[PDB]
Each structure stands twice: as C-alpha cells, then as structure tokens.
Amino acid sequence: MIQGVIQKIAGPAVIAKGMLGARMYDICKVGEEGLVGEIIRLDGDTAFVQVYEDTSGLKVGEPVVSTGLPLAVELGPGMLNGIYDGIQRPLERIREKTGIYITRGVVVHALDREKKWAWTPMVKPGDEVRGGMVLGTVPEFGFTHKILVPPDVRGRVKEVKPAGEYTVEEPVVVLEDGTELKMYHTWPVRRARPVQRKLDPNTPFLTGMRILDVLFPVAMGGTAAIPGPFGAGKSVTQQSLAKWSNADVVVYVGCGERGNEMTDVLVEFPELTDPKTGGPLMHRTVLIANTSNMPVAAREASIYVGVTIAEYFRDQGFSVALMADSTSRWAEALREISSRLEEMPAEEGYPPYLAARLAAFYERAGKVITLGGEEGAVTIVGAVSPPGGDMSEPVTQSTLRIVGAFWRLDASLAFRRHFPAINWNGSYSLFTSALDPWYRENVAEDYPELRDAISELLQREAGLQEIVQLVGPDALQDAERLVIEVGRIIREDFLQQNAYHEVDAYCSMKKAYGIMKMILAFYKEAEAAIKRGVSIDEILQLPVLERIGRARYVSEEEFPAYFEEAMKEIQGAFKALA
Amino acid sequence: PVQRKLDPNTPFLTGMRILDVLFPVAMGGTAAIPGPFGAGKSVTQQSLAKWSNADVVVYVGCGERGNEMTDVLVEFPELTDPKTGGPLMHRTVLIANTSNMPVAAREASIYVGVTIAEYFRDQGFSVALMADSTSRWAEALREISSRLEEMPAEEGYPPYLAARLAAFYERAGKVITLGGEEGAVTIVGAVSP
Amino acid sequence: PVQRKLDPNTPFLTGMRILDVLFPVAMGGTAAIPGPFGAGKSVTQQSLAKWSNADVVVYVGCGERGNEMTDVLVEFPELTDPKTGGPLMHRTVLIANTSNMPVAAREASIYVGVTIAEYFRDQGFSVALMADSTSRWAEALREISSRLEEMPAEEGYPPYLAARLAAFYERAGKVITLGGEEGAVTIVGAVSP
Amino acid sequence: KKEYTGITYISGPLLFVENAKDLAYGAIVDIKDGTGRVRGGQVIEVSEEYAVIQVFEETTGLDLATTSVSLVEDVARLGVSKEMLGRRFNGIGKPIDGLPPITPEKRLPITGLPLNPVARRKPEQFIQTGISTIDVMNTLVRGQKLPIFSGSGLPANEIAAQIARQATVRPDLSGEGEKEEPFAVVFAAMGITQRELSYFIQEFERTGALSRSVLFLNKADDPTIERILTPRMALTVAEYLAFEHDYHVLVILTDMTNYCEALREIGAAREEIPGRRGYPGYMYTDLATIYERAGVVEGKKGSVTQIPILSMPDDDRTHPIPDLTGYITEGQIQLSRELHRKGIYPPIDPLPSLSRLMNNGVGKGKTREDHKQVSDQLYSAYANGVDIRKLVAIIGEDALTENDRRYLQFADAFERFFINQGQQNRSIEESLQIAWALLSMLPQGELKRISKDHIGKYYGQKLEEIWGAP
Amino acid sequence: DLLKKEYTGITYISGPLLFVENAKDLAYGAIVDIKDGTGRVRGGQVIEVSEEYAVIQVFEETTGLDLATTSVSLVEDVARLGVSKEMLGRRFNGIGKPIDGLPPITPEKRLPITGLPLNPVARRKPEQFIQTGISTIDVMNTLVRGQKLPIFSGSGLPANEIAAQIARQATVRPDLSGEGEKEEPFAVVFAAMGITQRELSYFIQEFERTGALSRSVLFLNKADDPTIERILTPRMALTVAEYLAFEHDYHVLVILTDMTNYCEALREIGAAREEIPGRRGYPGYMYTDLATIYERAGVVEGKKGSVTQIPILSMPDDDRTHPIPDLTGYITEGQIQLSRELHRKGIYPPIDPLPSLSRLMNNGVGKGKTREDHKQVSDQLYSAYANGVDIRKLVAIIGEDALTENDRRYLQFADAFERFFINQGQQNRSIEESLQIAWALLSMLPQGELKRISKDHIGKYYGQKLEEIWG
Amino acid sequence: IPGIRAQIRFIQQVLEQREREDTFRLKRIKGKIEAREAEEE
Ligand SMILES: Nc1ncnc2c1ncn2[C@@H]1O[C@H](COP(=O)(O)OP(=O)(O)OP(=O)(O)O)[C@@H](O)[C@H]1O
C-alpha cells in the first residue's frame, strides 16, 4: 500500500512526498490519527491531499497512507430515518461516542452491523444473476427494501441463505465463481449508477404548492433550480417539498448551510405523517447534513453522496426526491480548493470545471428503466444562493442552462412577507406540454386551458403595470383596471400560500383547479358587467370576492361543496347587479 | 518621408453639396463617418470615390463581414470613372479582409493602405484613402494585445489605441514631395461602435 | 502615553456657523472633510487655522499645493491670535511636503505632525491638527506597496490602509497628561476622493 | 505505436508527459490507465521539456506510474461521406445511433480553411422556412448568417426542429426554375440535456426529416472539448456536401451560448487571462471562424446557410455573445416572452427582428414582386397597432379615430393569424395571402408603402381563408 | 512539554509575516513567542509549515525585529484559552490578557479557541421568546434565545445604542411561556474589534450604569491595537461563551462590535500570503471563517444554558450587496437593518422593518408563547407598511390631490407607523404594549382591508384609538 | 431620463473598474508564481 510523509501543511491542504504510484481522487489517511483526505494532484513524487477535517496540530513528517479507492458509499438496508455527514458518517453514533461536538478522526460504519433484518430470498440455486437484479427482500419502515446485485457483478447462484434474520455483513448469496454478495455493497460516489434506458417524463412531481404545481410544474424525473437572496424563503420551500411531495423516498442534502435547519427536520419530521403511506414522515427520509462550520471539502462529498443514495433508491424501483440546500456552497468549496491549488480562475474566481460538474450532477436525475427492469425516478431540486441576489452570477447562469424548471425568488415580495415570493415574470417551466395528458386524465379535462387563461391574464397585468407606473392606477380605463384587479386577486388568493397554516400548507390539484375556475368565471362576468356599464368600485365591493379570497383555507374534504356554492354565488351576484 | 507638410488651405471636393458646403474637408484632411445599417454609407463612399478630385483611391476593408466585402468586390468593378468613362478600378487599389482572416492581416491592413497612398502621393498625385470599419481594426488590435498578455484599458483596448489611431491619421496631409511636386493623401475613416 | 482618556465635553469652536451649529466637533474629537476639487477644502482649513479656539495649530500640508504654504507663511504673521493677542504665526507649526516634493515623505509628514501635536498636548494645550490631504498619504502607501510587490486591496491601496488611518485618528482625544494636567488634540482630516 | 510513459504531472484537466517532442501541436492522443481504460486528450503545448495534454473527461484513476500516452492523429480530422445523411454523431464524430460506422470518401481537417473573398458571390435566392414571420418579414437567403435570439424559457428548440423539418428551396419560383436541387440540413446541438436529445431524436424520426439531415449531438455532461469541436465538424460536413456535391446546406447551431461558455472554460484550463467580461480575448475570431464558413461561391451550384441560436443570458442584447454575433452575422430573429406567454407560437416578434440581406433575395423572379412592399407595410401597420393598443388603455376606444381602431383590430389579427401558425408549414404564397388578407382590414389608400398596381391586384381578400386555422 | 525549543533562522520579516527555516517540528496552527534583541516578547501563530520554512503571522507590530537577534519559541501546539467562572467581571484584550490590573485567572480548563462544530443531533430548537423592549424587533423581527441576529449599520448610525439597549432591556417572559417563574439574568460576553475610544467609553459607561459589568466578560481590541490580533478575539469570546453556557447553565448574550474590522484583518493576512482573493479583495474562504464564528450559537439538548449572538457590522456605503453583509446574512438567522433615511428624520431606533428578518421568529411566538395574534399582526403590519411606501412612490408621479381615500389612509398609516411604532426612544415596551400600539395603528385602516388577520382576532382587538395611548 | 442615464454610466464605470482590478490581481499573482518557479522550481 502506498505510504508517504507530510511535506507541507497549508490549512486543509497537505502535500505528501513519497506517494509515487498514488492515483487521482483516491482517499488517503493523513497523520497519525488517519484523517480522511483525497488526492487531487500528482506532481513528481508528491501528491496534493485535501483533508476532509481540521488539520490543526498536524506536523511535517507524519505518515500519509492511501486506501487506493475513491470515495464510496455503503448502499443497503439501514439508511432511511438516518442522518449522515458529508462522507456518510452516522451522526447519532458520533453523538454517542463523542459529546455534543464533532471531533476529528471518528470512524463509524454507515450501515448498522448489529441490527438484524428479516431476509426473504427471491433467487434459487442455478439461477443466473446480472447487475441490478433482485436477490431477496427486507422490511424497513413499511418499505419492502430489496437487495440488489452490485451493478458490475455477474454469475450463477451456488447457495442462498434460507429465510431468516441476519446482519448486513452476512454473505446472503454466494456465486459459483466464489463471490459472496451481502445485503449491502459499495459504490464509487462520482460514478453514475448505470440504468437500462432513460424515459421521457410524463407524470408530475406534486409539491403541494399551487404556483409551482400549476404555473411552473416539474416532472417526476425532472430538475428544478430555485435561486434567491437570503430571506426569500428557499429553505421553507425545500422543507415544504420534503413534507408534502408525492415521492416515495426523500433525500435531503444540507450542503454548507445552517445547522438549525437540520435540527428543525430532526425534531419535527418524526412527529409528522407521510402523505401517502401514513406512517411517520422521517421513515421516508435520509438526511445528509454538512453544516457551514463543518469541513469544507466534505460539501462536494455531501452532494455526491446524496445523489448516489437517491440513485440506489431509484434502482430499487422507487421515486426519489433529492433536495440540495445550496449548490452555491458546493461551488464556493470548489473555489476554495482551486485557490489553494493556485489554479487559473474563471469569472468570479470559480474553477473552469464548475459548470461541467454541475451538469454532471444534474444529469443524474431522471426517470429510468432500472437494470432490474423496474421503473424508478430521481427528481432534483437545487437551491442557488447568488451573492447580492445577482442572478447574473456564473452559478445561477450555468444552472439556468441545464434545468427544466426555474423558480426565481423575488426580494421585493419577500420584503412584503408575500410568500412563496416567486418572481412570476422571471420563472418558467419546460415540462408543461409533456404533462398535459396527465392533467386531462387526472385533474380535469380543461385544466390546461384554464392554466393558460391565468397565464394570459398575468401577462396582461404585467403589460399594463407599465402604464400604471407611468400615470397611476386611476387613470386607466375600466377594462384595464379590471385586469389589474383580477391580477391582484390571482396574486393574493391563488399564488399566495401559508406554509405554517393547518390547511393552506398543502393544496391538491383539484383545489387549485377550483380556485382558478372561480377566478376566471368572476373575470368573465365582471367583463360582461363592465360592457353593460357597471362601475369598477361596485364590482370590487361584491361580497363573493371574500369567498374567493377565503377559498385557500377550506379543508380538502369540505372544498367541493364550497366550490359549488361559490360557482352558484358568482352567477347570482352578477345576475343580481342587473 | 516628405520635404514639407503644407497647410490645410485648399478644399477636398467630394462632389456632394452637404459635405462640400456645410462640413468640408481640406486636401490632406481627415474625416470620420459612422455606419448605421440602412443609412446608405456604401453609396456615399462610392460617390466620394467616383466624383472626388482624387487621382487615385485606396479602399481598405480591415475586418468586414464576408458578404459586405463581396458587395464591395462585386460593385467597384462595375463602377465607371466620370472623367474617362473607363472602369473606376483602373485608378483604385483595393485591400480586402474578412473577419476570419488572420488577425495580423486585419491589423496591418490600414498600414498597408496608407503606405500605398503615400507612395502615390510621392508620385505627385492626390489620393483618397477610405478605411471602412476602423472599429474592426481596433478589435483586431485588442485581440493581438490580449494574446501578448498586456494590461487592458477601458473596454479591453490596449492603452496605446489612441496613439496608434493618431499615428495612422497623421500620415494624411498635403506635402511637397522629396521630388518637389505637390501631392496629398486624404483619409476618410468609418467608425462602427 | 497618557494617564487617562476623557469624554469630550467642550466644543472645538471654528468660526464657521454651519460647522459650529449643525455639525459640531468636540475639543478632542475627530472630523473628516471630504470634497471634490474646487469645493473649498483649503479655504475651510485655513479658516480653521485662523479662527479656531485652539491654543496651538499644527497644519500639515501633505502632498498639496506649495502656494498654500506660501500663503500661510506670508499672511499669518500679520494676523492676530484671537485669544493671545500676538501674531497668528506664533501659535502655528507648519509641516510642508508639497505635491512635487518626494512622495514617501508624505507619510513622515503625517506622523511628524501628529507627534508634535501630542507633545503640545502633553504640555497642557488644546491642539488642532489639520491634515491637508490624507488621500495623498494613501497614494504614497500605494506607491511603496507597488515597489514591495504587495497584493492590493480595492483600487490598488494596500489592505492595511484602514489600520494606518485608524492608528492616526486614534491619537486624538481629550486626556489627563502624565503630568496630571488636561490636554487635547483635535484632528480634522481632508480627503480628496 | 510508441507509448509515452514519462508522465510527471497530473492536475485537473492537464497532464504533462516528458520525452514527447514527437507530438505535434494539437494532436489527439489516447491515455491508458492502470485499469486499462482508455481516455482521450489533445496536445495544447509542446516543448523540449514536456508536452501538455488536455484530457477529455476525468483524470480520476490516473497515476504517474502506470499511465501511458499514445498518438492517435497529428491533426484532428473527420471522415466524411454522402452516407452521413440519416445518421447521428456525438460531437467528435462517433456514431450514437447504433448503425455501423461510415466508410469515408476522404478525411478533412475540421478547422477548415478561410474562403477567398474574391471567390465569393452575392446571395440572391431564398430558403422557405415555412414560418411566415421569417419568410415574409425577415426572409432567409441562401448564404446568409441569420441567428435566432432566444431567452431562458422560450421554445427555441421547437422552432429549430420546425425549421429543420420544413426548410426547402423553391426552384419553381425562380423564373424558369429547375426540376430539383438537393437540400440537406446539418443539425449541431451543443450542451443539450437528455430531454432535449430525446425531443430532437423523436422530431427527426417521426416526420422523416432524418433522411435529409446530419445530427451532431453533444450532451451537457459530455467533455467540453467535444462541444468546441461539434460546430467545426458540422460545418466541415456542410462544406463537403455544398462545395463537392452541389447541395444546398442549411446549418442550425442550437446553443452558441453553451459553445461560448465552453470556450471560456477551455481558456481558463490553458492558463489564459480572460478578456472582457470573462470571455477569451479571441472570442471574436473563433465565432468568426465558425460563422464565416457560410456563403455562396462563384462557379459552384451549392451553398451553405447558417442559423445560429442563442439564449441571451439575461435578455441583454449588449451581452458579449449577442454583441459579437450581431457584429459577425447579418440580422437576427428575436423571440418574445410576451408573445409566448400570450399563447402565440412561434413567438417571433417582427418589430425587433431584421434580415440584413432580405432585399437581395426577394422580388421579381424570386418569390413575388409584391414581397418587399408587403413586408414594409406589415411592419408599419403592426407598429401603429401596438402603439394604439397602449394608447387605448388610457384614453379608451371612443377617443380613438376610426383608423386608429382599424389598426387596433389589425394588430390583434396579426398576432392571432400571422405569428400564431402553430405547427403549420406555410408556403410563401400562403403567407403572402394571409398578409394581404390582414392588410385588407386597413382602408385602401392607407397602404402608403405599397404601389397601386399591387393593391389593385391583391387587395380585397377575406379573413375567412385563415380564420378557421389560427 | 516543559522544555523550551528555540528557532533562530528567521529569513524574512515583512508586514505581518515572518519566515523561519528549520522549524519542521512546529505544528500547524501552533502559538509561538517571538523574542527580539531587547528582550521584548511578541506572539504569533504558525499558518503554514513545510520542510523548508514555517510562516508565522505576528500578532503585534514588527518594529525592532532583525534577522540576527530574534528567536521563535514554541508556546503550545494548539491555540488554547484558559477558562473559568471567574472570567465574569474581568476585562481582557484581544489575546485574552488582563487589562484591568487584577491578576491572571487560574484556569479550570484550557479549551481550543477554534472550538468544534456542535453536532446537529445534539442541538435543540431555539424557542424561548426574548423581549428586547423594541417594538420593531418584538412584534416583527422577534428574537429567540439561541439565535444569531446581527445589526446591519452605517457609518454614523446608532448601532451601539441599540445593542446596549437590547442588553439592558432583554428578558424572557416565563409568565407567558407557561414556565415556572425564574429570575435568571443574561451574562454578557462583549468582544470589540477595532473599536474607537468614543464607542468604548459609551459601552463601558452604559454597562456601569446598568450594573452589568459584574456579569460580563470583555475582550477589547481597540483601534490603536494590532490588526492581526483581531483574528483571535471573536474565537476567544465564543470559547468563553460556549464554556459558560454549556458547562455552567448560563444564558449568554454575545455582542461582536464590528465584524467589518475582522474582515479587514482577514483580507490583510490573505493579501500578505498572495492568495487568489474573491470579491473586493476579500479571501474566498471568508464565508467559512464567518461561519466558524457565527455557528457557535444555539442551544443544546439536555442543557439549560444558551448562547445568543448579536454581531454589529457597518455596511460600508450603506451597501447590503457588499461581501461582508452579504455573507453574514447568508450565515445568520436574520438581520436588523438600520436606515439612514429614518435616522435623519429623527426616528430612534432607526430600524427599517422591510429589509430586516428573523428566521426563527415562528418558533417562539403564538398561542402559549407570546399571544395568539402575534404572527398575523406582524404580517398585517408588513403588508400595510409596504402599501404605504408604494403610495409614497406613487405621489411623486400622480400628485397628492389625485389619491383615493384608501391610498390616503395608507399614507397616514405609514407616517403614524414610523412616528409611533418605530420611534420609541429609550423606552422599554412590553410585548403587550407593542401589540396594543400595532392594533391602534391597524385600526386606522378599514376592517375589511386586514386580510392577514383572522376575524376572531379582529373582533377581539380591533378598534382602539391611538389617542388613548398618547394625547 | 437623464438621471437614469447618469446612473447607468456610473454603474458601468464601477463594474468595469472592478473587473480591471481583479484582472490586475490575477496577472500579478501568476507572474509572481512564475518567478518563484524560475527561482526555485
Ligand atoms: N444618394 C442617394 N440617392 C438615391 N438613393 C440613395 C442614395 N444613397 C442611398 N440611396 C438608397 O438608400 C439605400 C440606403 O439603405 P441600404 O440598406 O440599401 O444601404 P446599404 O448601403 O446597403 O447600407 P450601409 O449604410 O450599411 O452601407 C441605398 O441602398 C440606396 O438604395
């Protein structure tokens, strides 16, 4: 095994000599305490190692040892309901071994090797096995977790353990070639897990938020980016997706953000309920927390660990949602690394390969035919944190060219406490046309037309807002003031949503359709009234507007009756005006 | 070299009333014209070449598009000399460059044109030099300076852009040749910000 | 050194209504008077020197016009100290490093002036220190850092510029001298953005 | 043959190899690691001390002790053939459709030569894109460089596919004309996602346009150098076909913003100080070497026409990419988000769009005699209509004159029936018919920019001819 | 451990750095003593080490050093600070040395000043409402125990006054929280970097007036002190704070006077080392350094104490996009941003509510914590004030005489809001009085315009007039 | 309109100046690293 000694220490960067034969991007144990590092440069007999921990107290001459393998994740039973670090160290076990602080040099297994799992074999001797097939199954919190042949493994089965209880270290299946397949395997974190074929998304990823699910939808194998400045509500949106999305498994990556945001999930999710299964919400969740004051080099690791875990759960035939708290912090970590390496920067100091790395990460998303022939999907929602709120930054612009949906956040709306605070003008989705068949079959036959009518109304309001800023709102003619008012009704009664409310925190597609239909019918009747000579002031005082404004708060069970009453009441109110 | 550089006391007659009256340029003078699209700059330059009192004409295209250069190279052959009725090309030297020709050539185009103009001046003639798109020449200069790893100034241009333009434009003038005859070079540049 | 720093509780009377009324400075405080050229920095500071209620004025011409130094030298010997009654020059120390005098001496001039002001404070006097331009001191530091081959912060200035300015301005204050008497140094700083 | 093993440095995208003075500048090399995997790279610096290789893809498993470098070819070349029609490649020319590789007629340097200016000729004939806003108001002329300026969320890909499916020449419209002239479309897609790749494959396969197309598709997660090479290979094929087989070649370059970002990246990887706004100081020359590879040559029946497509980074036309492109190209087709969000497709806004060479490829003997004046009149009428549309919001419809009202109606009709053609394929005659039907709404004699002969000949058409198919 | 190892072999002194040749046995980050020819001893830290030389950042000025008579000796491998309960009532300088005449403290432990990250599993949820007495904070930008809530200030704005007022008035309200009444006060750890004598005299006199010096630990780095010393001051302060909170059940309030000065020191060192910098010359790792500082707040499961941070920074040109405020806001849990426009009108505290924020406010307000109407009243206030500012922008175009009655009402609301809710001087308001003033102001708008408040609360609290409170 | 034009000019100047300063810094650092490599490799 390749061994050497430290030659230079500058912060988290160590130069080790005597490492001839070391490979690029391999893990190395640094110092007498074996700090986990990675080789990022080879130069003659020297190697450039990035320590994933603090290097204070290290000395020149201390040994550096290479494991000869790149960063890898242990994939198998025991991840759901778990919280990990950037390199997949369980944090509950670190809490037990260490106190309330994280210390360096803790070695802890990712998967629990003492818990027992009820193994039910699904292969018999003499059966051919290929990468990604199902050998058996194991229960885990209401999921039928299935053990998969490692992707690059082939052969025929010699012996299969009988049904029973075993730890993940057990050689559950042995192959004629001698290979012993356990309940878990290891996968290089920078290699995309292979799939049979990628399919065109055709089903929505329902977040429970009206503006995103209606005006800016994202498909099940799609990718969305939500940029904004601090205070605009990115974390609240990501957590709402974690709580209310229709994905089977949710992976949450806290790349270089506040630790209180991880504490919030840990405390709250166990008390919440899975939207579909009904069990605890934390049972469908995997957390990867690398907070801001935790090692910088571990941010890249956190992102790739999350994407690998998501691809595993996709290979099992699930639909997985991956939330990246800030890809900007990943980019800043790359920049710190490159500055340490004395590389030639591009744009605002970022390494040239930042865009390529973002593209590689976002192209791991998608809906696939797994190597086992099932159907799984990964949907990636990445948050961006531009400096100054400037969306012309390299990170936001590079994301803008690879993602399907773009949920731009507005500081002006966040200042007024108008949430979700999405900049409608600066947001878009590329998944609308692909999801229309689903909407017709599963929401309402004319849902696409109503959505388009809402969009045309909003564009008309945006057009007239220029004249309003020029001459003021009272100078407008009656029809234009009606357009402005109905745009305001849309903003306050349909696009506004209260994450902390008991009912409004989640909205079904049918509730959204009902509110849209109410608003459009009101607009049509008001236009007819104005053509017949009814003042706007008399229109805006109609009490049916209060019903339209309180539709958001009607529970899901009571909503249909409320909607029928309101649809009757709108016609009544504009008939009574005469 | 020349023996003496005379004064701007005699006019350069373009034949166009607006320029010849309101905004005249002298023999040995210098003028600049901006080219918007659709303004008929090409016809104006062609008429200057046709009807100017210049004996010889040097047309330098320094970094033009391919199709604009093709227009120039297909139109000038068919132009007629008002004095003789023969092809105007017989008193014209034409320097043609495109955007995708070497940057060194695009940078040296105006210099080659001015040297030819000064030669015909030293023969004792009046020469009209028309540099189309000196902005493209400045772009070539900016690229060259970047490749030499020089500190840029203003919008990435080298700190000697003004001096090079000055040296170029100051080769214009009415002179007494070393041989003791009167000759002139008049420069009309174009700028496309 | 000093025994103790006191809390400013009396005004640095200037003779200007606007500064004395709307935007006062205490007897041991600090003020900055930035302005573009032609606004009246020099006239304002000379008026501070002529009319202020300070016992001693140390006037530092750091990298500024020499005619201003000549103006002070020629004029002050004829004016009268507002309180003492004697000639105004008799209460004034002049430190002059004009614009065309050596660049590095600007820093030395600033430090020399502030030390002399501290000395006269230590005798028990209220001292006014005028810095004709701290911008030129910053320029000198930038030049020397260019020679050192240091890496600049914003606009070429060395990153320790704020530290030097802070150290200079913190020498102001009302104090109990080591001799037990009360002294004060008031600093007005001109900046030429 | 010879394998170089004197690797003495690996860092990011670069590796240094000693005792390699036999490697030409810009040669393509193969990099074999200890595990046996073979990567690719390009020589970006050669000296007596060492050669510097830029590695395609990643340098993950490479080590200084077992890696070996070998020469593939001294100059990047592409084997071209007429058999490339109907085939899909990967940006460096490797098939990605599963059919056997092509046997080449010849191998050509991808960075072709500059055309001699004196061998060029004026563009004088038009390509019918099938889209009215282009065919009538911003005509595309064989040999022209006409980009589409797009935005972040706009359907540039759909418009590109539609043009690729519908583009044709019209020999019958050219005087006596000819029976047939070959036509091909070379589609270069750079930095596209899997969704866009699937969309493009399906679009070309379903309508049968594949049989007359060549596709060079480069994914966003492919190596950057392949992105840099994709347009060069596309144009090499286009030049082959046009100027050795008399084809009329249309080139669509789908995302030049992605190309320029790749250019910036590669510049930073070679240790070059960025120029304006981070982009290389030679970006103008590179974009010129790509764009200027189109035109029409004297003595050759073929032509090359380019349609670059750009997403303006933040709707800024002053951004360096669109600024330089406008400097080099001959007009622009601008998409609008207002039209898109109002439901109109293709969302082409005539007002900020211009084709610089339109006048030389429209008129008698090519299209129709009434083309130019019809275009000018449509432009003026639509501009008046939009202005009056803003004016009505303030002063109401009653305060308008009858003519102002007619313009107000015409603008809406124009958006609904002229711009909004959906997935239709309109011949130039159909588009001119629709234009005359719309102009008939305005009173005869208010059509100042059209001669009275054309008014007499074509004025009077009814909107019902297009009313049933918006 | 008890043996002194000296390193002659200094090859370079320039600015704040010092290269020493044969020091391969000096750990990274170790603290050293630099002895000069005259016997004066000055401190420094190893920031780079190799076989060739060690780079030392000097904590004092380099005057009087020479490459012949100077020696570097090792003090300790890891920078540590002796801590004890007896730190309360003491004043230290930027490197934690007494500056008050008393003797050095006898440590109970020596803790690494860099600290370690709190495990997210170990963290609690910050939930206890702190009543600052300032209505713009209590109602709209609530402060919860365990929070990091900075003040974004200007050059001549009164941030020090606001911080001192918060320290003087801050208290928990166990009566509202349903918890057993208890009278535990706040211990204040005060860290000043680059503080002038004027500001320091203000703070010291204010604490002496309040009687808070007895339960305060002061780390004072003045503006005449070494700049590189500022690197360690926040870390020493937070080491002491964490120790007190999580080993002696104190509720600690940490005030960090000027983080702009800290960033200036960071940039100085970064430039000396010829590192490739980020924005405006600041190092690219400044986010990580500021997070190493700010993330040392919060509350821990199974322990009674807490640490609350209120950093104060001066946005240079009142610029919120400057790197220092920008990174801070991305790290901290809100911000209280002052406004020069309000300050010029005479409004104190000049807190502009729209750009301010409190991330954790929802944790510590509502039924059973403050009052059931709190969150909705805060939301309504924000909406009404935003409408008022918009109408202010509108009058410049249309003119006042053209306004509607509702627009005029929102103008009047904005004026009254600024003059009565934000302007409170040095008065301590209970959350009840603050909500009463908020409801009085909201009663100036028609009851149907209050769309963020539930009709139950509108029935219960709407109507009361402002004249009843004043005049 | 003149006020908006003045603001645009000012913002353009500030941004261009920042880019120029960053470029000068990169050139300086790379030159110094090259000199260091020449002196000591
Ligand atoms: N003196 C003139 N008399 C009559 N018609 C003229 C005259 N000058 C120009 N024109 C006409 O006006 C047109 C000007 O617009 P056009 O787009 O055709 O010009 P261009 O020469 O191609 O453009 P550019 O300004 O870029 O050189 C000329 O093409 C010609 O048709």
Numbering used by the authors:
A (entry chain A): 1 to 578
B (entry chain B), C (entry chain C): 194 to 386
D (entry chain D): 5 to 474
E (entry chain F): 2 to 472
F (entry chain G): 169 to 209
From the paper:
Vacuolar/archaeal-type ATPase (V/A-ATPase) is a rotary ATPase that shares a common rotary catalytic mechanism with FoF1 ATP synthase.
Cα root means square displacement values between semiclosed B subunits indicated a significant structural difference in the C-terminal helix bundle between V1ATP and Vsemi1ATP when superimposed on the N-terminal β-barrel domain. The C-terminal helix bundle of the B subunit changed to a more open conformation upon ATP binding (black square area).
